[PDB]
Amino acid sequence: GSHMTFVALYDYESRTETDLSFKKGERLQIVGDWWLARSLTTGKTGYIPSNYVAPSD
Ligand SMILES: COC[C@H]1O[C@@H]2O[C@H]3[C@H](O)[C@@H](OC)[C@@H](O[C@H]4[C@H](O)[C@@H](O)[C@@H](O[C@H]5[C@H](O)[C@@H](O)[C@@H](O[C@H]6[C@H](OC)[C@@H](O)[C@@H](O[C@H]7[C@H](OC)[C@@H](OC)[C@@H](O[C@H]8[C@H](O)[C@@H](OC)[C@@H](O[C@H]1[C@H](O)[C@H]2OC)O[C@@H]8CO)O[C@@H]7CO)O[C@@H]6CO)O[C@@H]5CO)O[C@@H]4CO)O[C@@H]3CO
Ligand code: NI
Numbered sequence: 001g002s003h004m005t006f007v008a009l010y011d012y013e014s015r016t017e018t019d020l021s022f023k024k025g026e027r028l029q030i031v032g033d034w035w036l037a038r039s040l041t042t043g044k045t046g047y048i049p050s051n052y053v054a055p056s057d
Contacts, residue, residue, distance in 0.1 A: 002055075002057075003055065004029060004030040005027065005028070005029055005030070005040075005055070005056050005057065006027070006028045006029075006030065006037070006053035006054060006055060006056050007025060007026070007027050007028070007053060007054055007055075007056035008022045008023060008024050008025060008026045008027075008028065008052060008053050009024065009052055009053060009054055010024055010052050011023050011024050012048065012049065012052055014046070018046055018047050019034075019046050019047045019048065020037060020039060020044060020045065020046030020047060020048050022039060022041075022048065022052075023041075026039060026040070026041050027039075027040040027041070027056055028040060028048060028053055031045065032050070033049065033050055033051070034047045034048065034049060034050065035047065035048055035050045037053075
């Protein structure tokens, strides 16, 4: 109901073909430890480390 939107607590740089870079404060919508997410800044989709993000509006 709102547990699928998150905000980045730390910067993250992509390592592979499937992960998603993001900056601290960037909001992510979620589509385990790695979550498929869409950046609400760039609209790009990829996997993010779930411990790098926290619930957000
Ligand atoms: C230019 O104005 C036209 C547009 O204006 C209004 O849109 C606003 C929008 O409401 C507003 O949102 C709050 C903001 O948008 C931001 C997005 O919300 C945010 O997610 C991000 O956007 C991302 C996307 O998520 C990514 O997908 C990507 O987009 C690029 C596309 O990659 C998939 C790429 O293909 C290319 O898009 C083309 C598009 O092809 C898919 C093509 O479609 C025909 C054409 O788009 C038309 C569109 O059809 C038409 O729709 C009615 C209209 O759109 C207006 C919205 O309706 C209006 O809403 C209020 O005109 C478009 C332009 O002619 O052209 C596209 C551009 O080439 O390029 C995409 C851009 O790279 O990356 C983006 C950016 O990160 O950021 C958005 C803001 O940058 O702003 C919008 C206006 O800029
Ligand atoms: Ni929810």
